[PDB]
Amino acid sequence: SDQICIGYHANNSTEQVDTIMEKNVTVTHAQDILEKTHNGKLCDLNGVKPLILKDCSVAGWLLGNPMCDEFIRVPEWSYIVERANPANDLCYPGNLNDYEELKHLLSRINHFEKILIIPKSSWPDHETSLGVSAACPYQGTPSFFRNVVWLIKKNDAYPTIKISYNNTNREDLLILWGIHHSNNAAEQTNLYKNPTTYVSVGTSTLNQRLVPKIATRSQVNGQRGRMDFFWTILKPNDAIHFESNGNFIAPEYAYKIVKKGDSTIMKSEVEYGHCNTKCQTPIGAINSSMPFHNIHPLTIGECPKYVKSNKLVLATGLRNSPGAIAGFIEGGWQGMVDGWYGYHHSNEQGSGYAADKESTQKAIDGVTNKVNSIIDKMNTQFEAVGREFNNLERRIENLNKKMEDGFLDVWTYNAELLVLMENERTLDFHDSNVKNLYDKVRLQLRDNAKELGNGCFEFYHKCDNECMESVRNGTYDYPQYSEEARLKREEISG
Amino acid sequence: SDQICIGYHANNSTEQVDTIMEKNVTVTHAQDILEKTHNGKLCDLNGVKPLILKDCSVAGWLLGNPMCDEFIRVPEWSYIVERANPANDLCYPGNLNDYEELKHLLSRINHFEKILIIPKSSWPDHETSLGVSAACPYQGTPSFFRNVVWLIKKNDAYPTIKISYNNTNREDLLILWGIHHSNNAAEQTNLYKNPTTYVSVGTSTLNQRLVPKIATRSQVNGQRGRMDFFWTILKPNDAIHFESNGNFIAPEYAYKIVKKGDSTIMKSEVEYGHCNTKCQTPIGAINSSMPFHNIHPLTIGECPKYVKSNKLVLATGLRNSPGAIAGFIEGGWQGMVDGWYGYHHSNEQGSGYAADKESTQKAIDGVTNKVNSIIDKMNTQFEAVGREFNNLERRIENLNKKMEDGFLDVWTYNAELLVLMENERTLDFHDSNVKNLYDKVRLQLRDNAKELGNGCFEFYHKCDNECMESVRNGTYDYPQYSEEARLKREEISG
Amino acid sequence: SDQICIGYHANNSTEQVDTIMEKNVTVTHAQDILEKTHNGKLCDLNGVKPLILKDCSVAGWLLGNPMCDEFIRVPEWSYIVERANPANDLCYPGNLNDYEELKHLLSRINHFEKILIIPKSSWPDHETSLGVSAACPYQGTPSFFRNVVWLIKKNDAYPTIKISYNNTNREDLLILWGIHHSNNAAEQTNLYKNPTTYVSVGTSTLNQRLVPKIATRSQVNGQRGRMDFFWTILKPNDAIHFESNGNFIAPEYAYKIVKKGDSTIMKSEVEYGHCNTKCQTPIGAINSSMPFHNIHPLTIGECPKYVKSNKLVLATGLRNSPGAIAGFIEGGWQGMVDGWYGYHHSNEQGSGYAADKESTQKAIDGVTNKVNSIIDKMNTQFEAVGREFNNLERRIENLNKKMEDGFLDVWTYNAELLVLMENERTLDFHDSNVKNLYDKVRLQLRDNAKELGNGCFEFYHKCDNECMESVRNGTYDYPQYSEEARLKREEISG
Numbered sequence A, B, C: 001s002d003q004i005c006i007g008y009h010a011n012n013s014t015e016q017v018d019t020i021m022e023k024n025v026t027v028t029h030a031q032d033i034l035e036k037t038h039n040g041k042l043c044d045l046n047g048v049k050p051l052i053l054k055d056c057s058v059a060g061w062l063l064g065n066p067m068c069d070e071f072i073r074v075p076e077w078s079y080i081v082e083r084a085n086p087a088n089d090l091c092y093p094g095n096l097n098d099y100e101e102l103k104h105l106l107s108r109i110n111h112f113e114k115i116l117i118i119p120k121s122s123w124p125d126h127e128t129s130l131g132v133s134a135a136c137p138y139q140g141t142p143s144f145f146r147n148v149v150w151l152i153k154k155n156d157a158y159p160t161i162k163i164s165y166n167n168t169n170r171e172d173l174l175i176l177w178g179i180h181h182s183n184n185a186a187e188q189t190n191l192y193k194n195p196t197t198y199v200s201v202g203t204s205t206l207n208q209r210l211v212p213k214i215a216t217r218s219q220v221n222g223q224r225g226r227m228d229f230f231w232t233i234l235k236p237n238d239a240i241h242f243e244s245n246g247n248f249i250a251p252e253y254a255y256k257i258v259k260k261g262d263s264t265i266m267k268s269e270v271e272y273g274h275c276n277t278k279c280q281t282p283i284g285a286i287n288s289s290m291p292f293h294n295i296h297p298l299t300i301g302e303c304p305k306y307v308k309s310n311k312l313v314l315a316t317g318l319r320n321s322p323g324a325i326a327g328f329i330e331g332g333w334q335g336m337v338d339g340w341y342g343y344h345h346s347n348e349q350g351s352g353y354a355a356d357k358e359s360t361q362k363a364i365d366g367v368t369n370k371v372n373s374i375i376d377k378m379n380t381q382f383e384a385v386g387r388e389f390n391n392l393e394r395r396i397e398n399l400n401k402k403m404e405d406g407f408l409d410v411w412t413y414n415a416e417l418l419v420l421m422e423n424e425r426t427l428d429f430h431d432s433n434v435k436n437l438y439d440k441v442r443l444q445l446r447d448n449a450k451e452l453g454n455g456c457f458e459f460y461h462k463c464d465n466e467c468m469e470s471v472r473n474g475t476y477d478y479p480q481y482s483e484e485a486r487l488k489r490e491e492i493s494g
């Protein structure tokens, strides 16, 4: 007697997934949605190269530390790369005011151009070539920051400087200047003539007065003196006014600056790779559409959500053993190779496996749609994650840390449990589809066949391969065989 | 050829929903939980009107910029509305110290009353009516901030001012004063007699000393001088002590202030609408119990969660085609109008429809309960979202931006995937209810009935319409009919 | 006549759960995953005791308010406990600079040792014991901070102090000093001889100059004078240099400091309980593996996620009523006691209950695994939640408040909806298991038994207890009884 059986795909896969109720469940196909790979390279960000200060800090680069070795200034960059402890930074010891805000402002710059705004010819009554220190050596000779001029008395006199510069360019000007804290009255009168001095700086918004602190300090880079640097953004058609009778570190060069987007400073030792990316980490770039990653927290760009997890494996295929699906249908079919759910016939032209095209295709569509929903519903926007707070801003640094940790906890929990729940529902989806197929066949045949209890029906008539693929194609004629079935059904012993 | 069939509700609805596995699925009823509408108006917040500063800033309003409204009498407000760039703000150029913290303090005030604390009679040895400037015109002629007094020398002398004020009121006092940075020694001697001057201010907590910075600056509103203003909160029974020999901008009016909660500053040009609301946005107010909205991020009040989404549509009804639904039941019944699941019979009396009332009521209750759970479990508390950090606080503002973006991403992902998953579970719930109905009669009928294979049953006797409503009301009597059925059953072959 | 029935566990439990579709559903067993209990004590944190300042503030403890203990007996601590308003705090009025950052630095200290760095023998030409005030009582008599020295003129002279201290220890040194703001020229010359004075402090990084503000102030603790204190971290092998000609409040003691982690300051009056914990709240400690709690927001340690909820009750057992459960199987069996799903048989030998162990064990395993997944997938890391921003940092405090509120909203919503959805699915899981068991038996028996419509089958042959235990084990011998069954079936009809 001919029979027809309902079954499902099996294969050689050893891939495992977890569900909310079961762990280490072998399946026929799975997919990780957690991005774990990076190119180990520093790349352009959306087509724009980073500004890689390799042996210089932002401060030394800006002021023109003569000990920083190379300076092919670039007119635009997407982020700044410093390494962890730059060797060259403020050769003469001191400070750059509002340094962290300045670095954040310079993180991403649309246009950057160094220009000469006050040449040394502007100081006819002051010495312009002796403002030089062994703390800032160039090629064995004492020197100084190149973009600023350390003015010194001339003929034992330091006349009061009163000068102004109008920003006649059409871009903002980043301007830097400084004041020198000398060590004692003798050094004060040696460098400048006047013992009590000041530096006044004024713009439309700036109203600054600095007085040197002549006091004992510890030696740093061989110097007990200090130099405090300050900066401003001079808008077009505004003028900056300087006045000073000593200790003035005057601007010489400044920077035309056009700023649009923001970014941060990345600390990294990885090397530039002539690549492009939308998501950069300090150990490499990420090219991924996945919603989650575990590579590094300090990312710049449009990145997946950072989670603490080793794998996020969604089940795509069926339960695999290399109620349905290991219930009343005892097991899977390695023999069925071209589908997920299908049939196995046996008449007397032969045996074979044949996949049910329609339910297999709709289950594949549904599982693919589920994966694509878990991926595509993730909103990813540009974010720049750095560490931009100083030693006296640790409360804000802790606020940021609590924010980062909270978002990591939220995303980790949500992703893990989403994977578990949707894996369990995918396996149940397979179970219900298989049972629905068995019932579709049961309702095509009714009492022209006997249920055998293992997923198979036994025909009360002969069912040729046209009758068989008519059972698969949805095309079984019950009233036709109604009596070939009738007579063999009542002819049953025993 | 008598028949009875199991079926479900259908209608003309074209509403679509998405599930995690299927897109654009038409259903009989749906409900959006995403709020997308606003009244386009600025409203009271929980019964308290906002302080709408027309074309004036908080600074100009507080100090009494003469182009600012002096006849402003709002003793209470819930939030402040500024325009993007107010025209009237510090007519005489300069600064108001801790301006952003002061605006945050003033965001929501329970009581606000301007009072005279130091009358102009208090300065007998100084000129009180010469402190007037073209930078602060009233009706085109020179004037000054109205709540503060620019004291000028008298008879070429400026005696040292030593004055105090004890807060004998019962509320905190917001007190403002200032110092004038003159331009040169000549102007210094012209306005005040003394070349070297100061302003000292003392309370229980304040210990302030201000010295004028006499230097060259750029012209702003026609003035190269500056005025730096400062403020304090004088607690009841505490006294403020002022001392100065020049450049003093003395208090005249101050503000009794009672604060019982915070809010923020809203930037908006939308107009007041004499309305009330629990959630205000810069483009309109929101009246909604929904858990999510997509109108605007900078909201004040008890608002739904802001997400980046165009619709969040939950399925309430069933799959609509204008292992059950679209499985063996070819389609739904437009004819059944008063329920979700039910029956359709056809015998010699006629055909008709009857809904299974009790499973229909339980499905409606469950779907309504699911919608109400997705809505009611949302915790919504008061939050005030603004932009309160200045140009040199970009790191903190980026921290706030990262927080807002992270919460938007979290809520968007969670809402989208919750809607998808619960829609899939709702549709499967309908499928299971219909299959359970197909089975409930099958087990009431057993071998008193024949399965017909497309959702319909065949009776093994003819069953009057009282027997039918016994099949539906749960009380069909099997030993009643069993041998009328068995004798005719043993007769249909055929 | 012989029968076998499918049924499920019941008991007398009245515990209720909610699902996303049903409220107040009685079940056989439930489990709350919300931690709600605390031990009402302040405990060690991961083995490290807290530093409990009793009625002293960090300022009074550090400077040595004579009413404060030395708190030298704890060399390490995990967090600091202050009362809401410490009584002993800066007895002489004034300020401690960067006080909040200093408290954050001192929140958790790995090693802490008070050492003498400048003994009073270092001041041979200054008075060291007259710096005493009624604002700083010891036993009702005027005194002063003990770890700092109020230097006063000697023989109507105050020679210029120039002193240095080299950090010859191998840990960082916390060093504090101050300046005294006198009230008038007469008091200035009375305490120090020189009318115009200064204090200069220098290290490798510090470059500070302080000038006294001689001005009129309000009385605080009976004094109109003030004292402004400052602090620095002197790194090993660096030296601090002090210079001053008056008003100098000089250091005597300092603190060796070893820091390895941070924390926060907890405000609490609860007492130390000689306990240990991983999560501390201001009202008691928490010992819990649960993922959520509702006890208190200001926690320190590895805590559950704080949510706004009274219960998060997951269903573990079955639906209990003292589409299977209440579908065709009318109700549960109080009589069946060692299983969840099972059978009830009746033949010649007797009637009894027998659990289907295999489905019972895997359902128990799955439910336990679901609970353990909801618990274990929670990532919990160390966090310290305090209130560390001052009266002029309300914008940052509001940013932190918005972050905390946002995370509470997220966690509350997610936990509530997770419990609702997983309760739904657990109940549906039980129903599906019962239906699968009924189908296992139905497909073993086929036409050797009649379905009875209530969960029971009636045998068309005699089924002894071995035949019964073959039906339970899934291995019923259909061809063995099939022909007796067909003959008795053809006999009974009829």
Ligand SMILES: *[C@@H]1O[C@H](CO)[C@@H](O[C@@H]2O[C@H](CO)[C@@H](O[C@@H]3O[C@H](CO)[C@@H](O)[C@H](O)[C@@H]3O)[C@H](O)[C@H]2NC(C)=O)[C@H](O)[C@H]1NC(C)=O
Pocket (backbone or CB within 6 Å): A166, A167, A168, A237, A238, A239, B218, B219
């Ligand atoms: C910095 O330099 C610019 C000049 O490059 C200064 O702005 C200039 O101001 C003059 C008048 O103040 C403008 O001239 C023209 O004057 C007639 C008056 O009859 C007026 O009708 C024209 O529309 C125009 O205003 C000149 O265009 C303008 N230049 C620019 C580039 O705006 C500026 O004031 C200087 N800043 C300081 C602080 O000195």
Ligand SMILES: *[C@@H]1O[C@H](CO)[C@@H](O[C@@H]2O[C@H](CO)[C@@H](O)[C@H](O)[C@H]2NC(C)=O)[C@H](O)[C@H]1NC(C)=O
Pocket (backbone or CB within 6 Å): B166, B167, B168, B237, B238, B239, C218
């Ligand atoms: C401000 O004024 C009030 C009184 O107008 C002062 O408070 C009084 O202080 C004396 C003690 O010296 C008490 O006997 C009175 O009962 C107080 N009066 C009130 C109304 O409280 C207060 O000290 C003054 N403050 C300052 C800084 O001078």
Ligand SMILES: *[C@@H]1O[C@H](CO)[C@@H](O[C@@H]2O[C@H](CO)[C@@H](O)[C@H](O)[C@H]2NC(C)=O)[C@H](O)[C@H]1NC(C)=O
Pocket (backbone or CB within 6 Å): C166, C167, C168, C237, C238
């Ligand atoms: C400050 O203290 C340090 C610690 O001893 C001194 O550094 C040592 O100096 C001696 C001699 O110069 C060396 O042999 C040691 O190797 C140094 N130790 C370290 C860790 O550097 C330092 O010289 C002291 N400075 C002063 C001015 O006394």
Ligand SMILES: *[C@@H]1O[C@H](CO)[C@@H](O)[C@H](O)[C@H]1NC(C)=O
Pocket (backbone or CB within 6 Å): A023, A024
């Ligand atoms: C799951 O499999 C891995 C090996 O691939 C094993 O290390 C782990 O312990 C397994 N987990 C359980 C719960 O059996």
Ligand SMILES: *[C@@H]1O[C@H](CO)[C@@H](O)[C@H](O)[C@H]1NC(C)=O
Pocket (backbone or CB within 6 Å): B023, B024
């Ligand atoms: C769903 O419908 C919208 C129009 O209502 C259409 O734009 C969109 O492409 C449709 N999506 C699919 C997958 O058919």
Ligand SMILES: *[C@@H]1O[C@H](CO)[C@@H](O)[C@H](O)[C@H]1NC(C)=O
Pocket (backbone or CB within 6 Å): C023, C024
């Ligand atoms: C659930 O039970 C509690 C008391 O046990 C009751 O207060 C509450 O109203 C009940 N909920 C419903 C929906 O009946």
